[PDB]
Chain A
Amino acid sequence: ADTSVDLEETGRVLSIGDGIARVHGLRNVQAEEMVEFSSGLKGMSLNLEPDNVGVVVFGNDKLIKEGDIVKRTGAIVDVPVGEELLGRVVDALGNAIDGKGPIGSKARRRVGLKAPGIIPRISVREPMQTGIKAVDSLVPIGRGQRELIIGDRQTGKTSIAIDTIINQKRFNDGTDEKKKLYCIYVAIGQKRSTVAQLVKRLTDADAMKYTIVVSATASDAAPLQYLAPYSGCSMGEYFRDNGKHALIIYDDLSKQAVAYRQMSLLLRRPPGREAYPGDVFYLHSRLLERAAKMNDAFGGGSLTALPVIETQAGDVSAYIPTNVISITDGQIFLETELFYKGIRPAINVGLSVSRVGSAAQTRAMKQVAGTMKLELAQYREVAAFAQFGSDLDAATQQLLSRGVRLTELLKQGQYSPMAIEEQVAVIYAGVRGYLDKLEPSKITKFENAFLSHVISQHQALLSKIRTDGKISEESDAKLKEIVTNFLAGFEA
């Protein structure tokens, strides 16, 4: 009485094609449980139908044939979680892909867990410094916040994310454990050589130590690409639920949607708007709701997400683009026009927002950039309204004079994340009018000179602004003094 293959805990493949197995049997499987194929290939139980189980396959279905035995696992899909993963490159299921040995994982976590409710969280209040003036000054990001990076191909979306990961050494190399931020970088649909390029740079910046990289690339099965985000999320909740701080980049959520769309159509689920499943909003809401700030009652830890979405022809009104803009706590919109024009980052002031506002900003920063955002918005308008110097008054000549100078200061190169007090020093100079008489073309050069001066000579003012976290009345006076005088010697 060989009773190893009863149809309650095992089944047999009725048919297989395009990564979808229609398994017979599996009478006791649970929706969303993981199953195993004779070939050591894992799959996931998505459709539990009267006469069959629709199984999505986490790998090449070429090794699966009609008749194969499929075995339950009794477990709803999960993955390795914890500090062991830092500095490692894993696939969408947790397996290492840096051929640097097994992960020493002691904890596991379901990839699909609902986000903490109302009661367990507290308003986002601690800054999450990117290192990018434009961002940290105009569209501030706090911990537990979800801020979207969106724009066409090549407008610089990933860069924002890398600079951010790199900027975190400051605190991670420090003492304070509350200021530390562990990062997670999920590649989806991307190309292996690009990711390999990516993890190289991170290594060269001495950032891998605090980063985990979940990779679900271009040739990985649709279901791996699909899962990848939830997988990476779960690894971030480990830190979030244990009073630690995590930052996750979903690069990008566009390719995942495609994966979802594919997986979903191959299951024969009727296509919806634009060919995607009627629940693509849900696909991303479920995920991004998980980035959150827990109250002290739950460890005070947090998860901050920076999902990426690719627009086409800079059209942000597009259905997917707006679907995701309506989930996150703001967006950073990058335009190719601005980029080519010299404005890098190509952040579009007017169209980007932060729903957290200044609550995610240090007082030093709030002090200097409190009204700048709506000022630049109003500047872009009149700059357009006078692309014909229409008998323009002074209030608007002053508006155009600040607008241009401030625009130059928000410019920034790559890989050189600035420290908060450094940002405050340079914005200060502009916002206060000390630069209204310098020539726009000069501004970039001036900022390198000025910053040099204060960093070298004046670290007492930098350390105080940084420390007090505010701009006291004397600091504000020591600063006025430095800028005006250096400026003069500078314009000799």
Chain B
Amino acid sequence: QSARMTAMDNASKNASEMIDKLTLTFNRTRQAVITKELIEIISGAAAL
């Protein structure tokens, strides 16, 4: 019971950390897709 407690403390703390990282990775990606998709439109439009 003391080892399951310890193991589950860690697991839970790793999870949260993973959560915090994926979230930040998500926003970076979200911002780059918009920027990326918009530069693509501008390039096409300017070439005309």
The reply, when asked whether chain A contacts chain B directly with Cβ atoms under 8 A, is: yes
The answer on a CB contact under 8 Å between B48 and A270 is: yes
The answer on a CB contact under 8 Å between A268 and B47 is: yes
The chain B residue with its CB closest to the CB of A271 is B43
The answer on a CB contact under 8 Å between B40 and A270 is: no
B40: chain A residues at CB < 8 Å are 273-275
The chain A residue with its CB closest to the CB of B47 is A270
Tally of A interface residues using CB under 8 Å = 8
> Binding site of B, secondary structure by majority: helix, strand, loop or mixed?
helix
A104: chain B residues at CB < 8 Å are none
B43: chain A residues at CB < 8 Å are 270-271, 275
Question: Could you tell me the distance between the alpha carbons of A275 and B44 in the complex, rounded to whole angstroms?
Answer: 9
Q: Size class of B's contact patch?
A: under 10
A271: chain B residues at CB < 8 Å are 43-44, 47
B47: chain A residues at CB < 8 Å are 268-271
The chain B residue with its CB closest to the CB of A265 is B47
**Is A120 in contact with chain B by the CB < 8 A criterion?**
no
Give 1 or 0 for each of A248-283: 1 = CB within 8 Å of chain B CB. Answer: 000000000000000000001111111100000000
Report the minimal beta-carbon distance from B1 to chain A, rounded to whole angstroms: 23
Per the 8 Å Cβ criterion, residues 1-48 of B in contact with A are 40, 43-44, 47-48
Report the minimal beta-carbon distance from A221 to chain B, rounded to whole angstroms: 23
The chain A residue with its CB closest to the CB of B43 is A271
Report the minimal beta-carbon distance from A277 to chain B, rounded to whole angstroms: 11
The chain A residue with its CB closest to the CB of B46 is A270
The chain A residue with its CB closest to the CB of B45 is A270
Report the minimal beta-carbon distance from A104 to chain B, rounded to whole angstroms: 46
Question: Could you tell me the distance between the alpha carbons of A269 and B44 in the complex, rounded to whole angstroms?
Answer: 9
B48: chain A residues at CB < 8 Å are 270
Question: Could you tell me the distance between the alpha carbons of A476 and B44 in the complex, rounded to whole angstroms?
Answer: 63
The chain A residue with its CB closest to the CB of B44 is A270
A270: chain B residues at CB < 8 Å are 43-44, 47-48
Question: Could you tell me the distance between the alpha carbons of A268 and B40 in the complex, rounded to whole angstroms?
Answer: 16
A269: chain B residues at CB < 8 Å are 47
A268: chain B residues at CB < 8 Å are 47
Give 1 or 0 for each of A405-417: 1 = CB within 8 Å of chain B CB. Answer: 0000000000000
Q: Which residues of B contact A (CB under 8 A)?
A: 40, 43-44, 47-48
List 11 additional A-B contacts (Cβ < 8 Å) besides A270-B44, A271-B47, A275-B43: A268-B47, A269-B47, A270-B43, A270-B47, A270-B48, A271-B43, A271-B44, A272-B44, A273-B40, A274-B40, A275-B40
Interchain Cβ contacts under 8 Å between A and B, 7 examples? A269-B47, A270-B44, A270-B48, A271-B44, A272-B44, A273-B40, A274-B40
